[PDB]
Design a protein around this motif. Sequence first.
Motif, short mmCIF file in Angstrom:
data_model
loop_
_atom_site.label_atom_id
_atom_site.label_comp_id
_atom_site.label_asym_id
_atom_site.label_seq_id
_atom_site.Cartn_x
_atom_site.Cartn_y
_atom_site.Cartn_z
N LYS A 3 56.06 39.69 41.88
CA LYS A 3 57.54 39.56 41.95
C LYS A 3 58.16 40.66 42.76
CE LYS A 3 58.31 35.67 39.66
NZ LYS A 3 58.94 34.41 40.28
N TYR A 47 52.15 32.11 38.04
CA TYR A 47 52.84 33.14 38.79
C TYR A 47 54.19 33.58 38.17
CZ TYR A 47 49.74 33.15 42.83
OH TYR A 47 48.75 33.24 43.96
N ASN A 48 54.97 32.36 37.88
CA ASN A 48 56.12 32.87 37.37
C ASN A 48 56.36 33.47 36.01
OD1 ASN A 48 55.96 30.38 36.04
ND2 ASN A 48 57.81 29.47 37.06
N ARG A 57 51.79 48.59 39.46
CA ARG A 57 50.55 47.62 39.93
C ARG A 57 50.95 47.50 41.42
NH1 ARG A 57 48.43 41.94 37.84
NH2 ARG A 57 46.67 41.59 39.54
N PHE A 93 45.71 39.36 35.46
CA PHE A 93 45.66 38.28 36.51
C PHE A 93 44.96 38.65 37.81
CE2 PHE A 93 47.19 35.21 39.68
CZ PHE A 93 46.79 33.99 38.81
N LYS A 94 43.56 38.81 37.85
CA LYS A 94 42.94 39.12 39.02
C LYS A 94 41.81 37.98 39.39
CE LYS A 94 43.27 42.37 36.67
NZ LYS A 94 43.96 42.80 35.51
#
Lengths: 49, 48
Positions: B19, A20-21, B10, A28-29
């Motif tokens: 984020k 994630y970070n 997106r 990213f799916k």
Amino acid sequence: VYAWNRKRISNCVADYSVLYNSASFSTFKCYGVSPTKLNDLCFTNVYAD
Amino acid sequence: SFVIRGDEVRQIAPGQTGKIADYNYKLPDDFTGCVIAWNSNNLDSKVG
């Protein structure tokens, strides 16, 4: 591409917040499972191509 | 109205995870509206 690697991973603990970070990922799916509710689950085997 | 990065266009959608979509601007799943965006590199960009 045709000779794609397949790493079988077992007996480990993964947090998946590194995926994630990190903002370097332009793709990213996740399809069959929600990646945010992953650290509270446990699975039999995981394969990484 | 806000100005975001081209990679973050997106994230401004219902059900999106990221984020900006989690810490800056979150949109409900039952959204009744619309979103419009356009590039502004010629305006909001200093030479340095």
